[PDB]
Curated annotation (Swiss-Prot), chain A:
Extra remark: Was identified as a high-confidence drug target.
Recorded domain comment: The sigma-70 factor domain-2 mediates sequence-specific interaction with the -10 element in promoter DNA, and plays an important role in melting the double-stranded DNA and the formation of the transcription bubble. The sigma-70 factor domain-2 mediates interaction with the RNA polymerase subunits RpoB and RpoC. The sigma-70 factor domain-4 contains a helix-turn-helix (H-T-H) motif that mediates interaction with the -35 element in promoter DNA. The domain also mediates interaction with the RNA polymerase subunit RpoA. Interactions between sigma-70 factor domain-4 and anti-sigma factors prevents interaction of sigma factors with the RNA polymerase catalytic core.
Motif (Polymerase core binding): 36-39
Coiled coil ranges: none
Effect of residue 6 to A: No in vitro phosphorylation by PknB
Species in which this protein is naturally found: Mycobacterium tuberculosis (strain ATCC 25618 / H37Rv)
GO CC terms of this entry: peptidoglycan-based cell wall
Keyword terms, alphabetized: DNA-binding, Phosphoprotein, Sigma factor, Stress response, Transcription, Transcription regulation
Record-given protein name: ECF RNA polymerase sigma factor SigH
UniProt lineage: Bacteria, Bacillati, Actinomycetota, Actinomycetes, Mycobacteriales
Function description: Sigma factors are initiation factors that promote the attachment of RNA polymerase to specific initiation sites and are then released. Extracytoplasmic function (ECF) sigma factors are held in an inactive form by a cognate anti-sigma factor (RshA) until released. This sigma factor is involved in heat shock and oxidative stress responses; it positively regulates the expression of itself, sigE, sigB and a number of transcriptional regulators as well as other effectors of heat and oxidative stress, leading to direct and indirect control of up to 25% of the bacterial genome.
UniProtKB/Swiss-Prot annotation, chain B:
Organism field: Mycobacterium tuberculosis (strain ATCC 25618 / H37Rv)
Task performed by this protein: DNA-dependent RNA polymerase catalyzes the transcription of DNA into RNA using the four ribonucleoside triphosphates as substrates.
Induction: 6-fold repressed by starvation.
Name of the protein in its database record: DNA-directed RNA polymerase subunit beta'
Quaternary structure annotation from Swiss-Prot or TrEMBL: The RNAP catalytic core consists of 2 alpha, 1 beta, 1 beta' and 1 omega subunit. When a sigma factor is associated with the core the holoenzyme is formed, which can initiate transcription.
Family to which this protein belongs: Belongs to the RNA polymerase beta' chain family.
Curated annotation (Swiss-Prot), chain D:
Subunit structure: The RNAP catalytic core consists of 2 alpha, 1 beta, 1 beta' and 1 omega subunit. When a sigma factor is associated with the core the holoenzyme is formed, which can initiate transcription.
Whole-protein residues included: 244 to 438 of 1316
Induction: 6-fold repressed by starvation.
Official protein name in the record: DNA-directed RNA polymerase subunit beta'
Organism, scientific name: Mycobacterium tuberculosis (strain ATCC 25618 / H37Rv)
Chain's role: DNA-dependent RNA polymerase catalyzes the transcription of DNA into RNA using the four ribonucleoside triphosphates as substrates.
Lineage: Bacteria, Bacillati, Actinomycetota, Actinomycetes, Mycobacteriales
Transmembrane segments: none
Domain of life, source organism: Bacteria
Amino acid sequence: TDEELTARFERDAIPLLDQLYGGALRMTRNPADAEDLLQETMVKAYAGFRSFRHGTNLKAWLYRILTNTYINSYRKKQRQPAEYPTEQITDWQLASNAEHSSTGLRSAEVEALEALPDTEIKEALQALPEEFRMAVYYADVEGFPYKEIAEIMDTPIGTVMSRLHRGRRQLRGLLADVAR
Amino acid sequence: VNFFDELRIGLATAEDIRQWSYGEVKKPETINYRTLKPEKDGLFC
Amino acid sequence: AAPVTHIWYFKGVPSRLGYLLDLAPKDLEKIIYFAAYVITSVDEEMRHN
Amino acid sequence: LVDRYGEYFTGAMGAESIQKLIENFDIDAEAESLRDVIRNGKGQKKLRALKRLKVVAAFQQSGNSPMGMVLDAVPVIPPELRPMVQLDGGRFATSDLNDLYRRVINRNNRLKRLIDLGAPEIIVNNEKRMLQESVDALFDNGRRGRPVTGPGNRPLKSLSDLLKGKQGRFRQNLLGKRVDYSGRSVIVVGPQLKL
RNA sequence: CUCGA
DNA sequence: GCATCCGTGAGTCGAGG
DNA sequence: GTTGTGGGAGCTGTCACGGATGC
């Protein structure tokens, strides 16, 4: 009865899990972490209890199991990476993070002005014929594929790409001194 | 439009909790330490 | 993996769970945190037979 | 009582137990049988009746099935409301929430793995109690038992902490906020001023 | 944490 | 029959590190 | 894969009050 040789584990191993707790709590410094560790150790020991020799000391086996499980926990915690809890991340921390982010904490002013039109580039675009400029739009600003540009333009691909070249040349002419 | 008429509470049934959700998180992993990218199915997935 | 009581309604004095099932809060705790079994339902006909 | 008679009744410990007790619960029956005894007599038993009736009558007239009080699925708040950042030093800071959620999710996965491994009933019962305790922490940490502590033995700010107190959501962010087009400075008497 | 009204 | 045990209140706004 | 000996930090100088609970 291999299922009976497991219930015998339920008779012997269960009692000592109390002192196993005591020890794991002395190890982890935290009650909840001690409970998590005790459960992990019990799972590890029960899964491969076939390796437990009958009639021999079982407390030391589970003790080494718990110590090794704690070592594995720390090894996995090395690359946590370094998470710390706080009741609230501070404005200092938020701004200091924005000091290295892709986009900073933006202002209502920044947003509202961004919404406004860039007169220089708007004037440089209004110069080109609205066909070649519509093409440079569908191709550069929006990034459509040239096939989709030909589709939405109702024109062949060659005309679309020729308008693209001519308009890019023109606007680089007017926007070269502007770009800088 | 800031012209609501009433605001009401009630215990949420698991049905409401799942209708709200956009997916269930499964792992304790949060972000990839190296690439600073959210681990999938984690608390930041 | 297993249901959980909303601690607001168990530990929230007066225990809403208690008043709803007419159970003493201490017994309700014994039940919820696995220090005592509770009888879900009894088959009275089979017992009588 | 299980070795014999086991086929005749059903019993168990845990939250599933309370879920069942709530299922096999006639709300109208309890409400009216409590009204009968509330008008029957008067005294401590009548006070018990009135109190235990308020909640049952709310559950009756509200259309809120008491089943809600037991949860089979927990909701997770958007990450932006429990943000994560890194400070000078490569170390990371996160909201307490994230840590409580992480404990809940870890213990839930461990309970699943135990149920699969068909482990002793006592081990799975321990895991279920730990799951209940961790969800209680996630919701109203400190309310039952010892609060969950982070480094420095700081009780983590549970989800209830976000609404309570002078520095909770209501008093600190709804009844008063920080505004733009504002400034501060030290004042000095100007006598030449008009009122 | 210390300090200002 | 109530005595305890617990759980809730306990000023505002400002500056650093 | 774990097989010789095994109970942790924490309050811990607050007060005044009202109402479940619990013997």
